[PDB]
Design a protein around this ligand. Structure first.
Ligand code: CDL
Ligand code: 3PE
Ligand code: 3PE
Ligand code: 3PE
Ligand code: PGT
Ligand code: GTP
Lengths: 347, 175, 72, 120, 139, 49, 98, 55, 320, 88
């Protein structure tokens, strides 16, 4: 795009979510969700390729429909209390309505089939924006109305994300598809802890955000979208693959890496809430995520893969993009476990 | 009769939705919404709300829906299905008929319909309030606050529409 | 020397899915440039038949010409 | 949880009550950890950009260490304030609700009959 | 959850007919849900194949519920154990064996026995105890 | 010289680097100053002063 | 509660079913999505006018001016899948199988 | 018979086979919006009626 | 400042620099047809930027100190060996051709960068749109087999797609027997024992594919050697043509900014050259590739980023 | 009622005299979408007449004129980036 015109589209959506996290009025929250969608569509179709045209259509139809379902959740609450402020909802079906409506905007439960296809069609740079920033807007509302949430309603949504995210992730080939499924699996973790204490929901969000940028911008540097294409990068840029491995271990969740940050506190939090069978399933099924993390780890750096003659030409030229914030993002996503008591700052 | 006129219109409103919810030919589906759009204003009109109702005619029925069917006109295949055509379309229509008949029958006999929302089945008119409005229309004086109280609304809705104008070109540019 | 993966090991990862299945046995790999292949032309250049109906053609002036809706 | 306790001036990274806490000493083990992370950021920054790791633009390393320590130091103040705030309002509720936290009675182990299960 | 309430209200072992009808109702309802998804995400050729998929899935699920409720109840009062988890353990394998015959594979039948037998004991395990799967946010 | 083209980072960007030390010393001196007033304020408010 | 509101409430539901079920054409789906905000508009105006919530008259006008922005985006996307695929049938939109 | 035939096929291989089959089920979709949205309608219906969350 | 998007906003627009003399003229032809000679004459006549034929060691000339590296370290393919025996089991046939196509791709990119930046017209022999004639000749003559063709044209699809065809292409069509008439005089041992059919297969693949697949996108004007010495005529036709029927004289400034985004990122234009498709003749094994990379790394200058190698005398490394 | 009676009578007259006449004997899209966005922006300032009589019309002056310059701004961006010069 024209650099100045892509800039405003990048940050009209920055402001769209910014409205949601600051609006105290129900209508205004929908307003920010509208600008969220209205600015997301062009970015997904920066390159104008039939994958993007499909990805935009699938993304738009899903988000628009969820937005409409959100409105009548707003109307029903108005119909039964006449209150436009955001507080605990004053009617059950309205509460049930927006939980599904907000879920589809985020996408954890069966409302998740759009997530893989949309990111697969669109470019990697727009992939991180969809998988990182487009999740704060739905989560901000959920953390706001967590008091009125239905404990049964959310938790079954939470597992169905991690089980689906855990299972289907094994069979995926395209790195964007794997990243999307891990995002679905990660999405389940904080949504499950959302009814109990939203501090860990935000804590899981921040850590997951840090891990995803480290994942996406490294892949952008690799200029690769397939496992085999990522496999070749061992020879040209061995350092990146080594960093690819450490963030994969981190975002797998193994201690003392920062992936043990959210789970451990989340496991601890629900255990204080007498829910003990619930954490065990999520912790155990989290290994499904680790398997295709291992699969990517094996093919990236741990075992070198066959290369091509033409890539000797690649060594002759240096990189151009400075991939801003990459060094600090990696370190902030690997060795922050000893700073765990910093979670008290959020609350 | 005349007491149930809002109910009568509301009934046509529902069956009007079945017209386009059944997903017929896009032109014919638009027409089914056009009547549905038309009657819905009358429901609003009977409750007051002249200006809010009039928009449904102007900027939606004569507005959004005009370019809607206009797009269906130059798009779509050379063989537009006539409402009967596919048996599913008529199956959907009769399906919509049985939902409104069962509730309305249930509404006017037992008056204790509890489907999702518990709603008691009385006439439309037992909900209106009382009191004189002086010399100012409540609807007119409410949305006239767009420029006296609608501060943050105008700033945001105006900004998005400008982004609406830029997003539509960027998608339609073709790179 | 230490054993390293070979092409047969690599082609195992090279399928459209890690785990083959007859449903996905025909899913072709995505284009590397992410560019799906264009289809053929989808043009609507109708060749208008001016002439022997319109006084606009002043009479017997059959014209054959194609246009992009308006541009001849 | 916090969230909306009495007195919650929003977007206040350091409420005035935090000034009544012992400030984090510059030699804090937590604080120097922020410095260590800054160094690791500097090493990665040179590593990613094909630079001679340690001896490669030490000015960038200084900026990374300074930013991490400074951003760290304000974090511990908020970290200690909220942690102290959690216990402060805690220590007053028990006083206001004494019957909600009844005190146990002195019973030495000489009277407590803990069952002795033999082990074989 | 009135449908789930039926199984809980009837005492274990006693009123085997009521337990069997309630248990197969739970299985049949579950079979409806999965079959409805199966047609949705993976459509069959026509409607006749659609009901064919529903017929198989519902019959399997209803059979598992019927055999589990029957075996669990008939084992309870026969053994005079209205609390032992074993009363559900052989119930899980009863469904496990029932599934194995439904898809005609010995290996999947043994695995279903082992997995359902464990879970059925585990589901019973929480019934005597205070185990909660959807515990309310006390803290 | 090796490289035919003068390289992007071959010439030290003296304006940029001197700025970074400028922030580094500014960031430190504020940190030192911040700790003293915090210590003094805690010394005063909590009754020890 | 008056039957005119339940008439509106199903109107959302029948519109909701049409949007989700799909038959062939994205035009119909876009039409179904418009009945969504339509039935929302009468429902919003009906409650707000009944309760004399004067400032709340804001929302009806604000509701559809932003709902119409969906049409500005939704209609545009359709023509592009119409330009490339031909007919805008949802069945054509299956390239992103993986 | 015991070590690497049965003990290796009860815990490790059976779990791997179960995950493999389920991973096939979840990943193998059709990419059709009609089928995806139909699933959404069912989920909406079960949630509002059959999951009993409303009650 | 570089062409980072900030520079576009506060200034530089590509369209300002472009003038009439901003073509991408390529002078193609058969072997030893004077296409390099004719391209030099045309470029110096119009004062354009002539680019010599992209050889196996052209990439080395574009980086480092312009010193051709060792053949194993800079392509693992010798053209002379291919002329000596193309059917060699080492796969020198397709390996040389595939690397040459990448060399042309890098050559084409540098010409595009100079044209977009300076605005001066560029000239280069052959093209990335014309290297297919050799492999198609290399196919019908049995030098390669089907798998090499599939990889090459797929690389053409994934690389040449975002490279529009030049304004005008010059084709000097010397007859094949006449090319034979000069090659005995040339006396380069490898290129003597060419197959007459192969050079015949150079000519026809040039004939009904090059111009026809280039005519619809650009003007194709054709001569022979007798007009190569007569370059004063081959240049006035360039003056006469309007540069019509070409996708260059319609693009706006937005596309040019996008084009400069691609070209200035050298690895980006090379990213789709190294497709993970594993052709046996070009796939370097893990151990050999690792050793070769270690050989590349120990080379002076290549150890670190440009301007960051104290081995070559880069002072102030501690404060770069 | 009177309104319903008027429209009903008009339809019958049109219907009656129709019956006696039957038994007795991207550019195209762009103009649509640009109108749609302008029309929606037009509906914002329709309540202007009564809004002109608000007790804080100074704030009305800044913001009623706001929408009007945005109408110009939307057209201005449309005009400069081709836009109203439709594809031809
Ligand atoms: C907590 C700890 C963790 C989080 C810490 C916080 C930082 C998180 C982000 C780190 C950096 C991420 C990044 O950039 O990665 C590289 C990555 C790839 O960069 P790239 O290779 O240049 O490709 C991106 C574009 O395609 C490139 O397109 P382009 O070529 O057109 O270049 C555009 C670029 C380059 O600049 C320009 O084009 C110049 C524009 C000139 C006109 C405007 C002038 C004024 C601009 C500044 C105004 C202030 O400018 C911008 O992107 C401007 C964006 C800001 C707009 C401000 C004005 C709004 C009114 O960045 C992106 O993809 C950008 C995504 C959007 C921002 C990040 C969103 C993800 C994170 C969200 C959550 C953050 C935490 C929330 C809590
Ligand atoms: C938590 C558990 C552990 C988690 C992390 C595990 C990481 C490894 C796991 C396996 C990774 C995959 C297999 C190996 C991949 C290797 C990747 C790679 O790029 O290797 C080759 C590469 C060659 O090195 P090169 O880039 O040329 O740089 C040399 C130094 N200039 O090598 C490199 O580029 C590596 C360069 C390393 C530079 C190290 C610099 C050390 C500096 C020490 C400073 C000490 C200061 C002390 C101060 C004391 C007083 C305060
Ligand atoms: C005391 C109270 C309870 C009393 C009754 C006992 C419990 C209820 C009955 C048993 C429920 C669990 C057993 C599974 C039931 C569903 C079986 C089913 O769907 O079978 C069809 C199919 C398996 O065959 P397939 O892989 O399709 O291969 C053939 C293809 N032509 O299925 C599949 O392919 C998909 C895999 C099965 C469906 C998903 C999982 C369904 C079960 C989830 C847990 C249900 C728990 C119910 C009880 C507690 C809650 C009320
Ligand atoms: C909560 C609902 C989650 C739905 C997820 C749907 C996609 C992933 C599952 C899937 O595709 O199939 C699972 C199940 C069994 O599939 P089956 O009928 O055996 O067909 C196998 C050959 N395609 O088919 C299903 O439709 C069952 C899905 C719900 C199980 C509970
Ligand atoms: C590879 C599979 C596993 C291999 C073997 C691992 C070890 C086997 C047992 C696994 C134990 C996991 C759960 C233990 C976590 C701590 C539980 C604990 O401390 O005991 C509680 C036991 O309570 C539980 O219910 C804990 C879970 C019991 C088992 C059910 C879940 C675990 C089994 C299924 C998941 C793991 C198996 C793999 C599935 C794919 C006590 O709480 P309570 O019930 O007394 O609470 C007070 C009151 O009574 C209210 O309940
Ligand atoms: N195998 C192979 N050789 C190529 C390819 N492109 C160019 N060459 C070789 O490039 C060399 C130089 O081209 P020639 O035409 O012989 O060069 P020249 O003798 O200077 O003559 P002119 O090009 O007419 O100036 C020849 O040995 C060609 O075979 C290719 O795609 N494959």
């Amino acid at each position: 795009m024209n650099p100045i015109i892509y800039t405003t589209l990048i940050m009209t959506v920055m402001s769209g979510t910014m409205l949601v996290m600051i609006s105290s009025h129900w209508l205004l929250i929908w307003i920010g969700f509208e600008m969220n969608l209205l600015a997301m569509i062009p970015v997904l179709m920066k390159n104008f390729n039939p994958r993007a045209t499909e990805a935009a259509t699938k993304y738009f139809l899903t988000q628009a429909t969820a937005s409409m379902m959100l409105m009548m959740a707003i109307i029903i609450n108005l119909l039964y209390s006449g209150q436009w402020t955001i507080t605990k909802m004053f009617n059950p079906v309205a509460m049930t309505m927006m939980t599904m409506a907000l879920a589809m905007k985020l996408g954890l439960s069966p409302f998740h089939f759009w997530v893989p296809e949309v990111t697969q069609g669109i470019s990697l740079q727009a992939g991180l924006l969809l998988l990182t920033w487009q999740k704060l807007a739905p989560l901000s509302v959920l953390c706001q109305i967590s008091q009125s949430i239905n404990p049964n309603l959310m938790l079954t949504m939470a597992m169905l994300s991690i089980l689906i995210g855990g299972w289907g992730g094994l069979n995926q080939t395209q790195l964007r598809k794997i990243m999307a499924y891990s995002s679905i699996a990660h999405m389940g973790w904080m949504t499950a802890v959302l009814p109990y204490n939203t501090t860990m929901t935000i804590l899981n969000l921040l850590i997951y955000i840090t891990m995803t940028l480290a994942m996406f911008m490294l892949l952008i540097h690799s200029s690769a979208t397939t496992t085999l294409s990522l496999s070749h990068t061992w020879n040209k840029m061995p350092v990146i693959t080594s960093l690819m491995m450490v963030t994969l271990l981190s975002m797998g969740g193994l201690p003392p890496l920062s992936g043990f940050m959210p789970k451990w506190m989340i496991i601890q939090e629900m255990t204080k809430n007498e829910s003990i069978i619930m954490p065990t399933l999520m912790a155990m099924t989290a290994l499904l995520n680790l398997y295709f993390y291992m699969r990517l780890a094996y093919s990236s750096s741990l075992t070198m893969f066959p290369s091509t003659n033409n890539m000797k030409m690649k060594w002759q030229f240096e990189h151009t993009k400075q991939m801003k914030l990459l060094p600090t993002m990696i370190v902030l996503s690997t060795l922050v476990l000893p700073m765990t008591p910093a979670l008290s700052s959020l609350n | 009769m005349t007491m149930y006129i809002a109910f009568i219109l509301s009934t046509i409103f529902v069956i009007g939705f079945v017209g386009f919810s059944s997903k017929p030919s896009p032109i014919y589906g638009g027409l089914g919404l056009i009547v549905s759009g038309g009657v819905g204003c009358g429901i609003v009109l009977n409750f007051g709300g002249s200006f809010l109702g009039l928009m449904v005619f102007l900027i939606y029925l004569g507005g959004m829906l005009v370019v809607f069917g206009y797009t269906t006109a130059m798009a779509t295949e050379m063989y537009p299905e006539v409402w009967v055509s596919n048996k599913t379309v008529f199956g959907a229509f009769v399906s919509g008929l049985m939902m409104e008949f069962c509730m309305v029958y249930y509404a006017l006999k037992e008056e204790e319909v509890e489907i999702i929302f518990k709603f008691n089945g009385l006439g439309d008119w037992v909900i209106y309030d009382t009191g004189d409005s002086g010399f100012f229309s409540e609807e007119a004086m409410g949305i006239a606050a767009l420029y006296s109280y609608g501060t943050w609304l105008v700033i945001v809705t105006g900004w998005s529409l400008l982004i609406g104008v830029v997003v539509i070109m960027e998608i339609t540019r073709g790179n | 020397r230490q054993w390293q993966p070979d092409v047969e090991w690599a082609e195992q990862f090279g399928g459209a899915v890690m785990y083959p299945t007859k449903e996905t046995a025909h899913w072709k790999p995505p284009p590397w440039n992410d560019v799906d292949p264009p289809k053929d032309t989808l043009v609507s250049n109708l060749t208008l038949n001016f002439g022997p109906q319109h006084p606009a053609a002043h009479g017997v002036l059959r014209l054959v010409m194609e246009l992009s809706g308006e541009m001849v | 949880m916090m969230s909306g306790r009495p007195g919650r001036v929003p977007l206040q990274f350091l409420p005035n009550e935090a000034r009544s806490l012992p400030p984090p000493k510059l030699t804090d083990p937590r604080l120097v950890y922020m410095g260590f992370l800054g160094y690791c950021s500097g090493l990665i920054d040179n590593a990613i950009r094909r630079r001679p790791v340690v001896s490669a633009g030490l000015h960038r390393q200084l900026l990374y260490v300074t930013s991490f320590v400074f951003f760290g130091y304000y974090l511990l103040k908020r970290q200690d304030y909220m942690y102290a705030l959690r216990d402060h309002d805690m220590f007053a509720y028990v006083k206001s609700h004494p019957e909600d936290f009844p005190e146990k009675d002195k019973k030495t182990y000489g009277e407590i009959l803990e069952e002795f299960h033999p082990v074989r | 959850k009135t449908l789930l309430h039926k199984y809980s209200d009837i005492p274990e072992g006693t009123e085997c007919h009521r337990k069997a009808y309630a248990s197969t109702s739970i299985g049949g309802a579950t079979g409806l849900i999965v079959s409805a998804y199966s047609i949705a995400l993976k459509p069959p050729a026509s409607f006749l194949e659609g009901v064919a998929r529903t017929g198989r899935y519902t019959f399997t699920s209803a059979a598992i519920g019927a055999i589990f409720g029957l075996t669990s109840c008939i084992s309870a009062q026969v053994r005079e154990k209205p609390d032992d988890p074993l009363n559900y353990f052989i119930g899980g394998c009863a469904g496990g064996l029932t599934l194995g015959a439904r898809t005609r594979s010995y290996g999947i039948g043994a695995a279903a026995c082992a997995y359902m037998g464990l879970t059925a004991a585990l589901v019973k395990m929480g019934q005597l105890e205070g185990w909660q799967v959807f515990a309310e946010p006390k803290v | 010289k090796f490289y035919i083209r003068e390289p992007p980072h071959g010439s030290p960007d003296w304006l940029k680097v001197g700025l970074t030390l400028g922030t580094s010393v500014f960031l430190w001196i504020y940190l030192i100053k911040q700790h003293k007033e915090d210590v003094l304020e805690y010394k005063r408010r909590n009754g020890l002063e | 509660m008056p039957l005119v509101y339940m008439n509106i409430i199903m109107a959302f539901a029948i519109a909701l079913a049409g949007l989700l079920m799909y038959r062939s054409h994205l035009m119909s789906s876009l039409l179904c999505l418009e009945g969504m905000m339509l039935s929302l508009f009468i429902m919003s105006t009906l409650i707000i006018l009944n309760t004399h919530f004067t400032l709340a008259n804001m929302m009806p006008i604000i509701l559809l001016v932003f709902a119409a922005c969906e049409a500005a985006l939704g209609l545009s996307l359709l023509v592009m899948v119409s330009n490339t695929y031909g007919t805008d049938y949802v069945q054509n939109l299956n390239l992103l199988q993986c | 018979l015991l070590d690497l035939i049965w003990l290796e096929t009860i815990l490790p291989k059976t779990t791997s086979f179960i995950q493999m089959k389920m991973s096939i089920m979840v990943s193998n979709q059709k990419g059709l919006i009609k089928l995806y949205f139909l699933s959404f309608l069912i989920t909406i219906m079960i949630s509002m009626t059959l999951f009993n969350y409303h009650e | 400042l570089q062409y980072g998007p900030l520079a576009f906003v506060l200034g530089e627009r590509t369209t300002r620099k472009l003038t009439e003399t901003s073509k991408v003229i390529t002078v193609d032809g058969n072997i030893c047809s004077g296409k390099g000679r004719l391209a030099r004459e045309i470029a110096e006549k119009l004062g354009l930027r002539h680019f010599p034929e992209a050889g196996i060691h052209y990439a080395d000339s574009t980086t480092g100190d312009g010193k051709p590296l060792d053949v194993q370290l800079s392509g693992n393919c010798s053209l002379e060996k291919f002329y000596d025996d193309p059917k060699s089991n080492d796969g020198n046939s397709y390996r040389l051709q595939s690397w040459l196509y990448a060399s042309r791709l890098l050559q084409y990119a540098d010409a595009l960068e100079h044209l977009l930046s300076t605005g001066q017209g560029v000239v280069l022999e052959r093209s990335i749109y014309s290297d297919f004639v050799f492999l198609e000749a290399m196919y019908r003559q049995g030098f390669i087999r089907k798998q090499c063709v599939e990889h090459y044209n797929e690389v053409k699809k994934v690389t040449a797609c975002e490279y529009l065809p030049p304004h005008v292409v010059v084709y000097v069509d010397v007859p094949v027997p006449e090319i034979q008439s000069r090659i005995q005089k040339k006396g380069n041992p490898h290129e003597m024992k060419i197959t007459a059919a192969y050079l015949q297969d150079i000519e026809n693949a040039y004939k009904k594919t090059f111009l026809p697949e280039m005519s619809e996108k650009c003007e194709v004007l054709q001569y022979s050697a007798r007009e190569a010495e007569d370059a004063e005529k081959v240049v006035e036709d360039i003056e006469y043509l309007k540069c019509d029927k070409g996708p260059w004289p319609d693009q706006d400034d937005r596309t040019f900014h996008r084009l400069r985004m691609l070209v200035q990122n050298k690895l980006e234009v090379l990213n789709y050259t190294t497709i993970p498709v594993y052709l046996p003749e070009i796939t370097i094994g893990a151990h050999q590739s690792d050793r070769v990379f270690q050989k590349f790394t120990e080379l002076p200058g290549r150890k670190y980023s440009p301007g960051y190698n104290e081995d070559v005398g880069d002072k102030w490394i501690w404060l770069k | 009622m009177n309104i319903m009676l008027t429209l009903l009578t008009n339809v019958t007259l049109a219907s009656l005299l129709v019956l006696i006449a039957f038994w007795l004997p991207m550019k195209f899209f762009l103009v649509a979408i640009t109108f749609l966005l302008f029309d929606l922006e037009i509906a914002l300032l329709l309540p202007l007449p009564w809004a002109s009589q608000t007790n804080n019309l100074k704030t009305m002056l800044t913001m009623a004129l706001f929408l009007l310059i945005l109408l110009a701004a939307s057209l201005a961006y449309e005009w400069t980036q081709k836009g109203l010069e439709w594809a031809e």
